[PDB]
Amino acid sequence: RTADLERARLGDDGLDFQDDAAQARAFAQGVFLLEIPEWLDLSAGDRFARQFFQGTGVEPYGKYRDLSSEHFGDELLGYHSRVDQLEQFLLERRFWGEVYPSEIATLGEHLTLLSHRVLRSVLASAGIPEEDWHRASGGCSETNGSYHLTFNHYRSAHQDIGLSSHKDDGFITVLRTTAQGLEVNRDDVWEKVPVDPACFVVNFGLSMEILTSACVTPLSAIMHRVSHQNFDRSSFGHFSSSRCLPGADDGIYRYLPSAGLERVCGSRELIEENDHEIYM
Ligand SMILES: CC[C@H](C)[C@@H]1NC(=O)/C(=C/[C@@](C)(O)CO)NC1=O
Ligand SMILES: O=C(O)CCC(=O)C(=O)O
Ligand SMILES: [Fe+2]
Helix, strand or coil, rough: CCCCCCCEEEEEEEEECCHHHHHHHHHHCCCCCCCCCCCCHHHHHHHHHCCCCCCCCCCCCCCHCCHHHHHCCCCCCCECCCCEEEEEEEEEEHHHHHHHHHHHHHHHHHHHHHHHHHHHHHHHHHCCCCCHHHHHHCCCCCCCCCEEEEEEEECCCCCCCEEECCCCCEEEEEEECCCCCEEEHHHHEEECCCCCCEEEEEEHHHHHHHHCCCCCCCCCCEEEEECCCCCCEEEEEEECCCEECEEEEEEEEEECCCEEEEEECCEEEEEEEHHHHCCC
């Protein structure tokens, strides 16, 4: 019922697991734990996740309930009530400094850098040539990707599942969870992800799976869900995707030594299709 995940930490040369077999298990499973740097403050983000849905009466973050997608010219952004228990506030990096509270934008920038370092370590381990990283990652091997800082609240009063079974769209997801509910389907059995408030949960998205499908050890996008919540639950995540601007899409690529990078689809196209798959 409970999954046992490999634990890593960011070191001087990148991702440090206990050994090479632990990294090989972690990358093949598509999910692992990443120790949270002692200097990285998560307390403002935790409070934002507990508050964003409550409206302007609740300070300092309740007012973000009133910011819908029309405010951003991007239908994916802002407050969203989902068909599951989940309600969300999603915002891409181009809007953080202007729209998010100053300390929330700061959290997003720091998570972008941690995710940047995690991704470059992964691309090296997958055997992708370094000179192809920028195009292969749609900019995420540097800081030119699309990055969403997304806050999640599970309304326990709503029936049925917390968040439907799915895979993330992008390359790297850095997930901050302090309560039970997350479940992963490694192999073919659903398993609870253990709670560890000292670690992020890291997993790969669909773009990573597509990118590394022909590699020596292909990396998969883990299927995961949030079980029905009988009490309220909150969380937040940092998502790294190939640059998917409404007018500036970087596309999704498969790497093959015999051919280089072959375009598969567009980045926003993958996101819109996935959101349609996730919520039936
Ligand atoms: C790349 C932009 C998207 C919106 C980003 N990637 C995801 O896979 C996503 C999935 C859900 C389950 O959280 C949305 O319901 N969340 C995000 O923030
Ligand atoms: O809330 C969680 O623990 C998981 C949320 C999630 O998987 C997502 O928002 O994509
Ligand atoms: Fe997810």
